[PDB]
Design an enzyme around this catalytic site. Structure first.
Site, PDB file in Angstrom:
ATOM      1  N   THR B   1       0.726  -1.043   0.142  1.00 13.65           N
ATOM      2  CA  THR B   1       0.016  -0.002   0.099  1.00 13.65           C
ATOM      3  C   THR B   1       0.833   1.268  -0.045  1.00 13.65           C
ATOM      4  O   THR B   1       1.889   1.262   0.580  1.00 13.65           O
ATOM      5  CB  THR B   1      -0.946  -0.134   1.059  1.00 13.65           C
ATOM      6  OG1 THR B   1      -1.803  -1.230   0.879  1.00 13.65           O
ATOM      7  CG2 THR B   1      -1.788   1.103   1.380  1.00 13.65           C
ATOM      8  N   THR B   2       0.438   2.284  -0.633  1.00 18.34           N
ATOM      9  CA  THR B   2       1.288   3.471  -0.825  1.00 18.34           C
ATOM     10  C   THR B   2       0.060   4.432  -0.582  1.00 18.34           C
ATOM     11  O   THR B   2      -0.893   4.790  -1.402  1.00 18.34           O
ATOM     12  CB  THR B   2       1.746   3.725  -2.138  1.00 18.34           C
ATOM     13  OG1 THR B   2       2.662   2.614  -2.338  1.00 18.34           O
ATOM     14  CG2 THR B   2       2.544   5.236  -2.164  1.00 18.34           C
ATOM     15  N   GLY B 131       4.843   1.278   0.804  1.00 15.86           N
ATOM     16  CA  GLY B 131       5.710   2.109  -0.134  1.00 15.86           C
ATOM     17  C   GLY B 131       6.042   3.296   0.224  1.00 15.86           C
ATOM     18  O   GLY B 131       6.758   4.174  -0.549  1.00 15.86           O
TER      19      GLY B 131
END
Lengths: 244, 228
Positions: B1-2, B131
């Site tokens: 996940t970012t 991320g």
């Protein structure tokens, strides 16, 4: 003894329930609601007797959520306690089922709160009629339709084409019955509906109204939300009535 | 996940990727990690999908009630405080990093970070997720205060593309939303129009020389492409 607690009298009646209905008229104000083709409207007397009171802090209208409004008629603080319980109910429903509560379902839940006090001893009945207003969706076509539901101190819950509640409600209902015979209220425009509600108030109070003497609420097909109507829009309905 | 949020002059931009995974397999390639808490307040969610969905829903329920009781729109600081309290009271049983961001007329555009552990920090930008580690240096080199709304959308799209080209746990669409005094503006960029990826960068077109043909010299030239 039957006069003091919730037990039956010998004729099958409940006196604390009858007396809680006199509390509704004792308060001395009148309310009228009406449903037309595309909307529902509610007109209530705004009484600021004392010249030192700040008028925008005195209201009988409140939002339960974005899309449902109430009008309280009767003992004012009793009515505010039911606004808080209704708010709580609508928020529990949304948590549990993940959608906002429909106005017919909410009215039934508040009607059950009332019935519990007619059957258990020791808590006073609330001396109010609560009127609920909102739009509801059909499952067939998905179109939206306005509703009025009233809940009384006995726990009765019912829907109306138009209703008057409060002092001189008998005379104001008679008046709306006559007007209904011309054209059913569901065919009327907002303006025509409003002229009938304002004429009924005036006829029953035996007086003339300015915009500052009434507060008005509305939901519509165009805007679902329950909102206060601006004083300028009311003036123009009263002006339009004074002509005819 | 970012995930990330950045302040600009008169509001905020939130941005995220769209991938949800069990480690090495992608269960959803089009999740939506920007969750609405009130008309002009959103959060970004990282960690356990179950935990973040449950705490976002509870925070939203409490803000709706508060707004009805006061008859006014809520401030970003109130949403951050409610969310912080739920993260801190449940810290041993959840996996959650949150960013709360939004617009209100008292303080303008605001960004709050609530990392694992339940602390609450008020910043100019925030990064979160697996991320984020790839982006600290990108912001240290290329971020400035006072960007316009269009500058800031473009910057956040680029930042998300850089992180997801290097992080195996991020990928897919880039989703953005911009919050200011006007109406909220959402946008979704598909992978095919991403502003950066390694696959189309010209410095990574030519393959490394790992497989040189059998030869009479120690000079290294090209990879073998056909059988002898």
């Amino acid at each position: 003894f039957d006069k003091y607690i919730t037990v039956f009298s010998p004729e099958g009646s409940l006196y604390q329930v009858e007396y809680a209905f006199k509390a509704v008229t004792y308060a001395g104000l009148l309310t009228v609601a009406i449903r037309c083709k595309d909307a529902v409207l509610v007109f209530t007397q705004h009484n600021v007797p004392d010249r030192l009171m700040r008028p925008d802090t005195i209201t009988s209208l409140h939002n339960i959520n974005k899309d449902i409004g109430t009008c309280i008629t009767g003992r004012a603080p009793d009515g505010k306690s039911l606004v808080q319980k209704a708010r709580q109910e609508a928020s529990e429903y949304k948590y549990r089922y993940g959608s906002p509560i429909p106005v017919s379902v909410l009215a039934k839940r508040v009607a059950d709160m009332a019935q519990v006090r007619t059957q258990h001893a020791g808590l006073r009945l609330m001396g109010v009629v609560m009127t609920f207003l909102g739009m509801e969706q059909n499952d067939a076509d998905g179109s939206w339709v306005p509703q009025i539901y009233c809940v009384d101190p006995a726990g009765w819950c019912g829907s109306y084409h138009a209703c008057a509640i409060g002092k001189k409600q008998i005379e104001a209902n008679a008046f709306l019955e006559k007007k209904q015979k011309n054209a059913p209220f569901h065919t009327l425009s907002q303006k025509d509906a409003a002229m009938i509600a304002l004429a009924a108030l005036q006829s029953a109070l035996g007086a003339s109204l300015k915009a500052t003497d009434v507060e008005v609420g509305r939901c519509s097909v165009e805007d679902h939300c329950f909102r206060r109507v601006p004083d300028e829009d009311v003036e123009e309905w009263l002006t339009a009535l004074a002509e005819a | 996940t970012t995930i990330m949020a950045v302040a600009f002059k008169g509001g905020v931009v939130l941005a995220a990727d769209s991938r949800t995974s069990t480690g090495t397999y992608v269960v959803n390639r089009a999740s939506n990690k920007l969750t609405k808490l009130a008309e002009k307040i959103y959060c970004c969610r990282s960690g356990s999908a179950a935990d973040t969905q449950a705490l976002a829903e509870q925070t939203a329920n409490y803000l709706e009630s508060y707004e009805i009781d006061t008859s006014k729109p809520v401030n970003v600081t109130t949403a951050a405080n409610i969310f912080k309290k739920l993260c801190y009271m449940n810290k041993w049983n959840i996996s959650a990093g949150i960013i709360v961001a939004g617009y209100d007329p008292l303080n303008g555009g605001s960004v709050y970070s609530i990392p694992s552990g339940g602390s609450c920090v008020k910043l100019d930008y925030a990064l979160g997720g697996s991320g984020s580690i790839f982006l600290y240096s990108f912001f240290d080199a290329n971020y400035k205060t006072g960007m316009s709304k269009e500058e800031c959308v473009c910057f956040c799209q680029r930042a998300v593309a850089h992180a997801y080209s290097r992080d195996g746990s991020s990928g897919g669409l880039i989703r953005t939303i911009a919050l200011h005094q006007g109406e909220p503006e959402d946008m979704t960029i598909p992978w095919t129009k991403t502003p950066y990826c390694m696959e189309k960068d010209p410095k990574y077109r030519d393959l490394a020389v790992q497989n040189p043909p059998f030869s009479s010299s120690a000079k290294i030239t090209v990879n073998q492409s056909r059988s002898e």
